[PDB]
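Data availability (excerpt). All sequences and predicted token strings are deposited with the supplementary files. A representative entry, Lectin, is shown inline so that the format can be inspected without opening the archive.
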Amino acid sequence: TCKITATPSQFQPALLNASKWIWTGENPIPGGSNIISTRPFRKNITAPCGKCSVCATIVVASDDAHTFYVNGVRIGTGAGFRQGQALFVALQPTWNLFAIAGQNLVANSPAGIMASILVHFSDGTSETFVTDESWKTLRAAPPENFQLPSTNDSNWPSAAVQGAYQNSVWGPPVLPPVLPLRGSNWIWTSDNVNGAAPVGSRAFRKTVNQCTKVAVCATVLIAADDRYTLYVNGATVGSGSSYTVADAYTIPNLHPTFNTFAINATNGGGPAGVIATILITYSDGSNETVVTDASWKAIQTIPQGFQPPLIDEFGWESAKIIGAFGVAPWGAGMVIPSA
Ligand SMILES: *[C@@H]1O[C@H](CO)[C@@H](O[C@@H]2O[C@H](CO)[C@@H](O)[C@H](O)[C@H]2NC(C)=O)[C@H](O)[C@H]1NC(C)=O
Ligand SMILES: *[C@@H]1O[C@H](CO)[C@@H](O[C@@H]2O[C@H](CO)[C@@H](O)[C@H](O)[C@H]2NC(C)=O)[C@H](O)[C@H]1NC(C)=O
Ligand SMILES: *[C@@H]1O[C@H](CO)[C@@H](O[C@@H]2O[C@H](CO)[C@@H](O)[C@H](O)[C@H]2NC(C)=O)[C@H](O)[C@H]1NC(C)=O
Ligand SMILES: [Ca+2]
Ligand SMILES: [Ca+2]
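Structure token line:
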């Protein structure tokens, strides 16, 4: 219902610094011993002002495990307090019901859930929402359909705070990478032969087109040896020149059904490659991941308009897999921005 005037930008990490650990308060000592149990947590969050909410980056950690729901839909499952888990989800424009089922799995041990929800709005702004005492819970196993908006949480008690980011039994969870490179492939043109490749620029193209769904936001993690410039639906998103520090980008104004990612990557000499991971969120709560692989198309001499969405791909080849993320010479040490 709002015009999206947000444009592609550098990825903005959701942080855990303002967030709180929550549980039920069955033990009034925070951080105290709790029984083996499963417990529900809910929060209805509304968009401010004359702002529409579009999508969200979530970071969630638990002692011991969780399941995360948005507007009734399961988005993810995770565990552990040492490191957060990254989730991405499209949102309803004016309100969104977040719900989490947490489990304590060890007897007499502490229990708790911590999250941060960075909501991106139509106008290009953002706000972080956190787990805290304003969430609702129950001192009992979650009812059938606790996560659906149609459940009335009006008589539920308030959640009890177990600790804060810096001051808790858990200590501060480490942020995960925004997206994994494990799972992707360094690619190039066919050109790249014995730890190769020649000195040109080369172009790569991937199209995603699920005509029965509505695509909302994309997040892109990318790096290249040496340098790249990245385009989505013909517009310039960004560029880089490091094969040891990756760049991440947010595309909040995706086309609903058809989107094209294109890269001009340049080899200055020696080995060469481009690697990327892309996550696209859909309005029904589902998502998809695309990675650099052989489904991408590539070409040795870059034509005018290589970046437009609808060009003829005749005489582009299947991109060559140089190797899975990890291979020499680049190794596994890429610095990846935090979620
Ligand atoms: C993308 O959505 C799906 C669910 O709609 C999520 O993952 C599936 O469910 C779990 C939960 O983390 C994963 O273990 C599996 O990998 C998926 N199924 C398998 C292996 O069979 C996923 O969390 C979502 N990703 C986000 C939101 O970033
Ligand atoms: C989350 O909060 C919103 C805003 O308070 C609720 O939506 C409103 O519901 C009222 C009465 O039920 C309607 O008359 C309004 O038109 C709605 N307001 C807006 C701004 O949309 C929403 O129902 C809540 N969701 C849940 C699951 O509790
Ligand atoms: C692909 O990218 C490379 C590197 O960014 C381009 O080569 C540069 O282009 C400018 C033209 O504006 C030249 O003045 C420079 O010689 C190059 N600069 C550097 C720093 O190497 C190449 O032209 C790109 N575009 C296409 C469509 O191929
Ligand atoms: Ca525990
Ligand atoms: Ca090189």
